[PDB]
Amino acid sequence: SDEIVWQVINQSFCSHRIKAPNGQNFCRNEYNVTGLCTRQSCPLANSKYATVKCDNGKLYLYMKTPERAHTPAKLWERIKLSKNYTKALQQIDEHLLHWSKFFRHKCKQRFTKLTQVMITERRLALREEERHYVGVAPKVKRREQNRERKALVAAKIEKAIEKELMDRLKSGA
Amino acid sequence: VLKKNPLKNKQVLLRLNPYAKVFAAEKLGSKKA
Amino acid sequence: EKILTPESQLKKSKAQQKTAEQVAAERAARKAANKEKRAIILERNAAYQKEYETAERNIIQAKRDAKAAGSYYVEAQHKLVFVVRIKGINKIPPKPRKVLQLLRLTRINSGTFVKVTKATLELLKLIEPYVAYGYPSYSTIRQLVYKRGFGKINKQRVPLSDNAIIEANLGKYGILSIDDLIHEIITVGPHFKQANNFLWPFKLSNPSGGWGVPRKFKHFIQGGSFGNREEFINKLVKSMN
Amino acid sequence: HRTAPKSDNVYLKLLVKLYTFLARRTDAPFNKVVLKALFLSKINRPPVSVSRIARALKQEGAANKTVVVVGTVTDDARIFEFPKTTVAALRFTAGARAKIVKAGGECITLDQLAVRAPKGQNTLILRGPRN
RNA sequence: AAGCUCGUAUCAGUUUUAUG
RNA sequence: GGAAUACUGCCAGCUGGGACUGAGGACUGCGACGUAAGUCAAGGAUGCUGGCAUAAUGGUUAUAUGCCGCCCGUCUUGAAACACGGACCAAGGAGUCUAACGUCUAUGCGAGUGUUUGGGUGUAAAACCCAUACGCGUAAUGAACGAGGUUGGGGCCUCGCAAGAGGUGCACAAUCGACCGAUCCUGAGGAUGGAUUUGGUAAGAGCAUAGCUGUUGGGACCCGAAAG
RNA sequence: GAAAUUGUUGAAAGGGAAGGGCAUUUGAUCAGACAUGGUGUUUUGUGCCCUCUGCUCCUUGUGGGUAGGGGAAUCUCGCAU
């Protein structure tokens, strides 16, 4: 039963539970809509669930029902949302007919967040960066410091400058 | 959530003692013998 | 084919509609009752104001007639006194402390209305050094009930801010408004005890202008603070309040 | 001052929430009594023998009244003329269950009794001897 | 600390009254 | 002859100067203005303006200075005092284990309970099952005289809008009492008949496991006491 | 390569010693966007967009995946300027 599973996952070491310093428990399950391990939010403890996911740029409406609880292979019935904010929201509302207000509202919120996350193309389209984050290991740092000091010591910059000056102004102007 | 002290802020004062409006309009406080 | 609403959802909707109809009917009845009670409270307040004016005019006229006739006037005995704690909650002997606790004077600058009786007079005399009391006037009682008027509801100090609050608890004895409570307190009646018990003990601050004496711990008849100050108690309370 | 039970059983916790919900949303004293009894320890919840239930059934109108035992029902070999009645308890022993079923009666759980009697309709509560 | 009977008329480091 | 002023107390009278707080978070309520629409200082602040990315601002050290602060731990005596340790620092250091007897707590069974002394079995000190025995309890000092009648009793049902009235009642308490066996006598060898009461049954509650925890003996919270 | 401890350098303070707390000024010093868009419009080119023909998965649903031929003068359904 869901209640037994809900109790077994609240306590008794649910696999995906993150103990944040604030005390909030964060769920890392991909199918979760809020990412938090709470009631009516964890897909495992809820026979009926709805979430929005996307492999490619297309956004899908993943939903779960008790019918496929016996068949974990094809539990979710994803449907394409025909990417467009207004019509996608209308389609989500139509699909989630008579569903809980919580599920509908949070699915719409997840879809909106994912759609606005697609703006990442803006950063990729207008980046023209000349820095490209570079990491330097401490071992490389040591070889770039002690060797530099040795080169400076062996260079004899003052002596070289004096020799060059004594040569330039000894055979011409 | 917050206590509205009467004797000031006539708005709350009128909520209690509905005779306050009559008292003020009639100037009963300065009644003459 | 068309998707039909869940049967449980249909039952929930039917129950919600049926409950909402009753809620609207109750709201209309409550509005009508509130209007009627507001009218009743208005007429009661007018009657109480007229009664107070007539009483004061009669007292003054009786005093003047007694003066003119050459016969001494028999002033009515006082029946209501307000007692305010002066000393602290430490170093108090057990006997006065028990009386103060019985009077709900558990902290400094705290007071309550006490009925005047032969028995209560002895209690006040017992705790005379640690308390100051007098004869409150109508204005002081009204100001106290209006500003620091807190009622005791199911062991909770619910502030008094609406006639409905008083009516719910004190409506059994006919007290359905703050004005009714003030009238009962000032004019001791059959249900004075219940009204006094319902009111939470008053929490008063230090006087705005100060106690006015270099040493509080002395009899009021000798420049002190405690004792029995007949009329100066009103001024003391007003400064404290 | 008893507020919650010390038992870690999940089913007992579910029964406790159900009884608390019924008590808070029905104001029926019958639900409150069972809710309070649920928090009692094992020692405070002595078993109620089937013979004790049969003796208690001797009162008038026992057929129309169901019997509810907070603790566990234990079989008794000293009684054989067990009447036909519905018994609800947290646990039923094999012997007691067989005796109740054999005599034509029915044994149910606390939730079954609650659904059958949300406000304790014709419900009799029996407490076993303390010592 | 747990249990039962419970909210009262169970009482007072108080006062009067009564019996003396 | 006449008013005015001083003092006391009231104003649900009017109106300026200053300081802190902005708590709640879509409406449900008490209220006011308004014929109405609508508005409001009515169960907690809103609108506008000025400073800002080589920012605005914020954080650490000492000194600059308004005030306060006896040297830490243990132990004497009602207190302070006095007594014993402390030159500084890194590591170690102390209610830990076991046998028996118990309370509370949870589980499994329940008038039954305890697989593991051993055998079978085994992916091998791992995991699973128990033929007979054995520990505990299940019946007092015939329990049906009859597995008991009254008064209360958490609860249940009827009447009642409620107040309350009526019917039935677990555990548990008083009472009426009876009984198993026997006192205290008697006196057909010990029957019969009198006088008190006796500790409890009337319709079981225990077993094993696990956690905090109490007592006793074991080095027994750690070191240290003349020694045969 | 930790503390006690010792030496050099820099800074600060000091008349018969000091340390700590509430509280502010000062030097020195540290942190201080790899933030940068959003809205509806106005052109152009594309696509998962329009049109014709198709292939394939479950089970069958308010579905999923994937090709071939044509276009913008219907086109803001998204993307690009």
Side-chain angles (χ1 to χ4, degrees):
Chain A
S1 70
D2 65 312
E3 272 290 292
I4 269 51
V5 174
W6 164 232
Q7 271 103 51
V8 170
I9 65 134
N10 209 153
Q11 43 268 16
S12 203
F13 168 58
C14 169
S15 274
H16 44 70
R17 265 189 180 276
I18 313 303
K19 275 279 177 79
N22 181 86
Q24 195 71 24
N25 292 301
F26 274 76
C27 180
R28 59 145 62 79
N29 193 299
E30 300 201 341
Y31 292 97
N32 197 331
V33 284
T34 69
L36 274 47
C37 209
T38 63
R39 233 303 188 190
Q40 69 165 338
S41 194
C42 203
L44 310 191
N46 270 71
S47 317
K48 275 191 82 174
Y49 207 78
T51 188
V52 187
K53 293 169 73 182
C54 52
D55 297 9
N56 307 334
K58 303 162 181 181
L59 277 153
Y60 305 84
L61 189 282
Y62 282 74
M63 67 194 124
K64 183 175 71 155
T65 55
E67 219 196 70
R68 294 140 209 293
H70 223 316
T71 54
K74 212 280 292 295
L75 261 163
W76 277 278
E77 305 161 37
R78 72 189 196 164
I79 303 176
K80 199 190 295 99
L81 289 173
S82 87
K83 52 189 85 175
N84 43 18
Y85 194 83
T86 40
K87 209 182 174 166
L89 284 188
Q90 192 196 299
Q91 192 144 247
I92 291 158
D93 265 301
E94 286 173 32
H95 276 108
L96 279 70
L97 262 162
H98 316 308
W99 279 62
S100 321
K101 63 179 196 166
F102 172 98
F103 274 114
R104 284 165 60 266
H105 170 219
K106 294 219 167 274
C107 281
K108 293 168 72 170
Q109 196 160 69
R110 178 67 170 188
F111 168 76
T112 297
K113 179 52 173 166
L114 292 175
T115 307
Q116 89 194 142
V117 163
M118 192 251 288
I119 274 58
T120 298
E121 69 186 346
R122 193 202 84 230
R123 192 73 270 172
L124 271 57
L126 310 170
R127 23 168 179 163
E128 287 90 339
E129 265 172 335
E130 300 277 303
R131 310 287 272 288
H132 52 273
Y133 269 128
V134 171
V136 188
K139 190 163 70 176
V140 177
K141 200 206 300 184
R142 266 284 178 75
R143 286 190 285 114
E144 287 187 326
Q145 188 170 344
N146 306 12
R147 303 195 179 188
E148 182 175 337
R149 290 163 169 191
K150 288 188 187 187
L152 170 57
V153 169
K156 300 160 184 174
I157 316 196
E158 280 70 17
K159 285 177 178 172
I161 295 156
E162 291 185 24
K163 191 191 172 191
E164 283 294 340
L165 290 168
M166 285 304 313
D167 295 343
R168 278 182 158 184
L169 281 100
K170 201 163 178 179
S171 62
Chain B
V1 83
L2 193 271
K3 180 169 159 63
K4 305 285 176 163
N5 178 28
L7 311 184
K8 41 184 81 179
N9 189 335
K10 293 159 188 182
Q11 195 60 230
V12 61
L13 176 58
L14 286 163
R15 190 199 296 159
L16 291 309
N17 195 341
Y19 192 73
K21 182 183 160 169
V22 180
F23 197 102
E26 294 275 19
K27 296 277 190 175
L28 206 147
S30 313
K31 180 169 179 173
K32 278 180 80 178
Chain C
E1 249 284 22
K2 192 173 188 175
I3 297 147
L4 315 179
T5 50
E7 269 56 25
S8 78
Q9 188 171 331
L10 174 138
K11 293 174 192 305
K12 183 183 168 61
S13 67
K14 285 183 171 182
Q16 281 175 316
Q17 293 166 3
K18 285 190 166 168
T19 51
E21 288 179 348
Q22 192 271 355
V23 170
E26 183 62 19
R27 184 164 190 277
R30 158 162 62 77
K31 291 279 281 190
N34 291 6
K35 192 76 77 63
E36 183 162 39
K37 193 52 53 64
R38 195 165 190 74
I40 291 160
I41 294 159
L42 182 78
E43 63 173 18
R44 277 185 162 201
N45 296 6
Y48 298 151
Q49 168 49 38
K50 194 169 175 68
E51 184 177 312
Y52 300 143
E53 201 274 330
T54 50
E56 84 90 24
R57 276 293 99 179
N58 292 338
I59 289 157
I60 285 163
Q61 190 64 52
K63 272 191 178 187
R64 290 203 271 216
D65 297 347
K67 280 189 291 181
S71 305
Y72 310 117
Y73 177 52
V74 280
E75 57 175 292
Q77 307 188 355
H78 293 104
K79 60 224 296 187
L80 193 279
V81 291
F82 187 60
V83 195
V84 180
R85 203 193 216 281
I86 309 303
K87 207 156 196 307
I89 204 177
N90 47 12
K91 210 166 190 175
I92 313 308
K95 211 168 179 187
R97 209 181 73 207
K98 186 60 163 172
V99 180
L100 293 150
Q101 287 175 331
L102 289 169
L103 298 182
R104 310 192 283 175
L105 312 178
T106 60
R107 73 187 84 198
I108 193 172
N109 308 332
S110 72
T112 40
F113 301 118
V114 171
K115 180 171 165 71
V116 172
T117 74
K118 205 159 183 169
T120 56
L121 186 273
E122 277 290 331
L123 299 174
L124 296 188
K125 223 294 190 198
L126 207 153
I127 59 165
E128 173 169 39
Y130 314 110
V131 301
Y133 65 97
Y135 309 122
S137 64
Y138 170 72
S139 176
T140 51
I141 294 159
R142 169 169 161 287
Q143 280 194 354
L144 287 173
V145 172
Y146 267 45
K147 193 179 178 179
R148 300 281 162 73
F150 290 74
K152 174 163 67 166
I153 318 184
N154 57 78
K155 300 173 278 284
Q156 299 201 342
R157 175 181 179 247
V158 172
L160 307 177
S161 66
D162 186 9
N163 292 301
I165 299 168
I166 293 99
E167 179 171 65
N169 290 273
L170 253 62
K172 188 190 288 183
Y173 321 109
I175 298 152
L176 48 81
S177 68
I178 196 163
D179 299 295
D180 284 292
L181 206 153
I182 289 158
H183 172 277
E184 271 282 316
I185 291 291
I186 189 178
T187 66
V188 178
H191 301 288
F192 179 81
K193 174 188 186 162
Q194 282 69 242
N196 200 42
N197 200 257
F198 163 78
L199 282 169
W200 201 270
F202 291 90
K203 295 170 70 173
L204 300 161
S205 208
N206 303 84
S208 171
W211 298 90
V213 285
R215 305 209 83 261
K216 308 205 314 196
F217 298 104
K218 269 190 182 183
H219 215 296
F220 176 74
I221 65 184
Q222 57 189 269
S225 284
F226 72 78
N228 190 349
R229 43 172 75 198
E230 303 198 358
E231 224 69 27
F232 300 92
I233 199 75
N234 292 280
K235 185 172 178 186
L236 185 269
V237 169
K238 283 209 160 186
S239 73
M240 284 185 79
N241 192 46
Chain D
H1 266 66
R2 199 68 255 156
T3 293
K6 289 200 185 286
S7 175
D8 204 35
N9 191 351
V10 68
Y11 298 112
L12 202 80
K13 285 177 176 166
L14 298 186
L15 286 164
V16 167
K17 192 211 294 224
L18 198 155
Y19 269 94
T20 49
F21 168 85
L22 285 176
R24 72 179 186 77
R25 280 281 278 288
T26 67
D27 70 65
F30 160 81
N31 301 84
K32 296 190 182 187
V33 173
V34 183
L35 184 269
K36 197 262 281 291
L38 280 166
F39 309 146
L40 296 174
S41 57
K42 211 193 80 171
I43 282 165
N44 297 317
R45 292 186 289 91
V48 182
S49 67
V50 68
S51 63
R52 186 169 291 276
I53 299 171
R55 183 201 191 183
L57 286 173
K58 294 289 188 179
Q59 54 149 14
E60 307 302 333
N64 313 44
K65 295 171 190 166
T66 73
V67 69
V68 189
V69 163
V70 189
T72 75
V73 180
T74 57
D75 207 25
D76 200 323
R78 281 83 62 76
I79 64 103
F80 314 101
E81 300 173 334
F82 188 67
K84 184 185 293 199
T85 45
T86 300
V87 196
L90 282 169
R91 295 171 192 78
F92 293 91
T93 58
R97 187 181 290 274
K99 196 168 277 284
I100 294 158
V101 176
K102 280 169 68 168
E106 188 178 77
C107 52
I108 62 180
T109 47
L110 291 188
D111 61 329
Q112 287 187 76
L113 185 272
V115 61
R116 290 172 183 197
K119 298 186 162 190
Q121 281 106 25
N122 316 100
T123 53
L124 170 56
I125 310 177
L126 298 183
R127 286 188 282 178
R130 275 286 161 100
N131 200 333

